[PDB]
Amino acid sequence: CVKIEEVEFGEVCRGRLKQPREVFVAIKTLKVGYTERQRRDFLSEASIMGQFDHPNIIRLEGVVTKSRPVMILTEFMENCALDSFLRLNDGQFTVIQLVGMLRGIAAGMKYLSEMNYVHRDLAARNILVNSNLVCKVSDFGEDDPSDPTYTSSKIPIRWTAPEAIAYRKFTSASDVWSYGIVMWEVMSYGERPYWDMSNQDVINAVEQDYRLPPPMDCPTALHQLMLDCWVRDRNLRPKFSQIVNTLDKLIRNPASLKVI
């Protein structure tokens, strides 16, 4: 039922699906000479992905394991990752549209969290965008390599709550910390969280109560909600339902988004 047009575990192609109407899709193929371990992990990521169903979580259309090569089919998102999408479009969206993007992402995270799923790598680079500007939470798919995005231990320092760095305490509340960072990315149109602070400086800074400032022209309401997400006391951070609720409050009362 699949076809491949313009082309970790293998390739990353653009394809076309035809189910009993035809759509564009994203296809992960698995390279020649994959290991049992490269095959076991590649697919179980599909398993993880295919237990979800929500308009802000990336859809697994399907998977074909009955032939070589074996594929994971997911939904096509024309505008790619949110962070590059925001960079290419600096200043081009209204505050309401940005809140809209955040609202969708907060809604996907509320779904995952009610499913007892902890994402662990929530970041703009893992949020995909379609042609209607709908943002969907994604996974399984570099400004300065000296301060890399990921540190091996698997941990994206700049996006990770201090208790998840220090003690591997990964929970929905650690995802909420990450969402705060995602808010800051969106509102700044894709700046690097913490800029030319070394990865180590960021851990040090955070433990010292440094929090990222408001992006240019960011409404005080929105920055306040970031600060809430970055409470050192994980128990005080809002839940994702509360974040969705706060963002809806702001959409119902847009005058309140004018304070800067």
UniProtKB/Swiss-Prot annotation:
Phosphorylated. Autophosphorylates upon ligand-binding. The chain holds residues 632 to 905 of 998 of the full protein. The active site is at D121 (proton acceptor). Residues 2-251 form the Protein kinase domain. Keywords: Angiogenesis, ATP-binding, Cell membrane, Cell projection, Developmental protein, Disulfide bond, Glycoprotein, Kinase, Membrane, Neurogenesis, Nucleotide-binding, Phosphoprotein, Receptor, Repeat, Signal, Transferase, Transmembrane, Transmembrane helix, Tyrosine-protein kinase, Ubl conjugation. Heterotetramer upon binding of the ligand. The heterotetramer is composed of an ephrin dimer and a receptor dimer. Oligomerization is probably required to induce biological responses. It comes from the Eukaryota. Receptor tyrosine kinase which binds promiscuously transmembrane ephrin-B family ligands residing on adjacent cells, leading to contact-dependent bidirectional signaling into neighboring cells. The signaling pathway downstream of the receptor is referred to as forward signaling while the signaling pathway downstream of the ephrin ligand is referred to as reverse signaling. Generally has an overlapping and redundant function with EPHB2. Residues 1-260 are cytoplasmic. It comes from Homo sapiens (Human). One of its GO terms (biological process) is dendritic spine development. It is found in: Cell membrane; Cell projection, Dendrite. GO terms for cellular component: cytosol; dendrite; extracellular region; plasma membrane. GO terms for molecular function: ATP binding; axon guidance receptor activity; ephrin receptor activity; transmembrane-ephrin receptor activity. Belongs to the protein kinase superfamily. Tyr protein kinase family. Ephrin receptor subfamily. The gene is EPHB3. Changing K28R: Kinase-dead. Loss of autophosphorylation. ATP binds at K28. Ubiquitous. This is Ephrin type-B receptor 3.
